[PDB]
């Protein structure tokens, strides 16, 4: 668990922070359920938005088979 | 605007009119007019060579600029006009040097709009550019088939072409017919669609409305005697033969294109 973003006082998740976002995607590129990472729901939604934005900018892959 | 007529008389019950209040109500621009008298569909042998042509209203010809050759000089749309010679409306445009021209009215165009042709003209409806300067995917009309010859494709009301690909000296176009066609990328096209799209929604309502347009009645081949038409004859309503033209060519599916000279430019036919 240990939702990191509340303990870091973030106001957003920042789609440009690929280091943080790689901790929330599986090796195939899928977004990890918050019931596994322990993320709070609000920050899970922020995280999903950020990952989708990063995927659009090709900073993250959609899958591992591009 | 598409407006139905009220059934105050049987010839009006089914009439559907296209009313465009934006169209100039006065006379057309006289220096761009010339007479064009009727043919009755007869050629210089005086023989009918295209049937069902005759009568209809007197019409003056409007000299329309299909070439759009006046590069780098802006023009402003003065007004839109009814043109009897074509389905599309036309626009009287005024160039900054004082010259006036008629152009095909694109969809959306209206009085006060600015237009321009040339290599550096902005990508805006009504602007005309060589197609090598127009983005792939764009919607265009009045497309040239040879550079400098003047637009010949997509001129009727509502029509347009899509620039689907560019390969070297050629672009591939999707014509309204569905045909995929190549022409040289130096050929000019005008951004946007031809206006007056509701033209096809009109309903003539009565026979006389076809007569006003210079269309004479069509007589069915099966209504004649054998001497007149392959379909002719029979005691009662008979047919019993494969449908043909008055001249005997099969007229239900038989193909007639034979132009080996232009086959190379057809990427795929319409189907």
């Amino acid at each position: 668990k240990f939702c990191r973003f509340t303990a870091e006082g973030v106001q957003e998740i920042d789609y440009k922070d690929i280091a943080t976002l790689k901790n929330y995607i599986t090796e195939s590129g899928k977004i990890v359920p918050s019931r596994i990472t322990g993320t709070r729901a609000k920050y899970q939604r922020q995280l999903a938005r950020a990952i989708k934005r990063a995927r659009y900018l090709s900073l993250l892959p959609y899958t591992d088979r591009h | 605007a598409v407006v139905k007529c009220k059934p105050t008389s049987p010839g009006r019950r089914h009439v559907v009119k296209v009313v465009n209040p934006e169209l100039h109500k006065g006379k057309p621009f006289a220096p761009l007019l010339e007479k064009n008298s009727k043919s009755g569909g007869r050629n210089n042998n005086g023989r009918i060579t295209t049937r069902h042509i005759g009568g209809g209203h007197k019409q003056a010809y409007r000299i329309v600029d299909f070439k759009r050759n006046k590069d780098g000089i802006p023009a402003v749309v003065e007004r839109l006009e009814y043109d009897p010679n074509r389905s599309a409306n036309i626009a009287l445009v005024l160039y900054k040097d004082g010259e006036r021209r008629y152009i095909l009215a694109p969809k959306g165009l209206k009085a006060g709009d600015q237009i321009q042709s040339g290599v550096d003209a902005a990508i805006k409806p009504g602007n005309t550019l060589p197609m090598r300067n127009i983005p792939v995917g764009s919607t265009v009309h009045n497309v040239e088939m040879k550079p400098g010859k003047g637009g010949q494709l997509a001129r009727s009301a509502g029509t347009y072409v899509q620039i689907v690909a560019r390969d070297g000296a050629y672009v591939t176009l999707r014509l309204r017919s569905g045909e995929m066609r190549k022409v040289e990328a130096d050929c000019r096209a005008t951004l946007g669609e031809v206006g007056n799209a509701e033209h096809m929604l009109r309903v003539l309502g009565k026979a006389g409305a076809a007569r006003w347009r210079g269309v004479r009645p069509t007589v069915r081949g099966t209504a004649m005697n054998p001497v007149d038409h392959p379909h002719g004859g029979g005691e009662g309503r008979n047919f019993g033969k494969h449908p043909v033209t008055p001249w005997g060519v099969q007229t239900k599916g038989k193909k007639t294109r034979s132009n080996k000279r232009t086959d190379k430019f057809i990427v795929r036919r319409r189907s």
Partner: protein
């Protein structure tokens, strides 16, 4: 589930690694899920019933831990 066979790794071990990668990514479950169309009403009914059964089972377990069988 892309798997690279590491050096001096027996084949059966790497096959197991690939199998676990596939079972983790849920590829077979996704394929089976997508064989046929299930109406949204059926999907919602299935999800609701699964949640209800999960909750009822959990409560039965909690209240059986207070129950002596013999």
């Amino acid at each position: 589930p892309v798997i690279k066979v590491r050096e001096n790794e027996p084949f059966d071990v790497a096959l197991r690694r690939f199998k676990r990668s596939c079972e983790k990514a849920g590829v077979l479950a996704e394929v089976r899920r997508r064989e046929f169309y299930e109406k949204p009403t059926t999907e919602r009914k299935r999800a609701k019933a699964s949640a209800v059964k999960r909750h009822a089972k959990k409560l039965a377990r909690e209240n059986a831990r207070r129950t002596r069988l013999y």
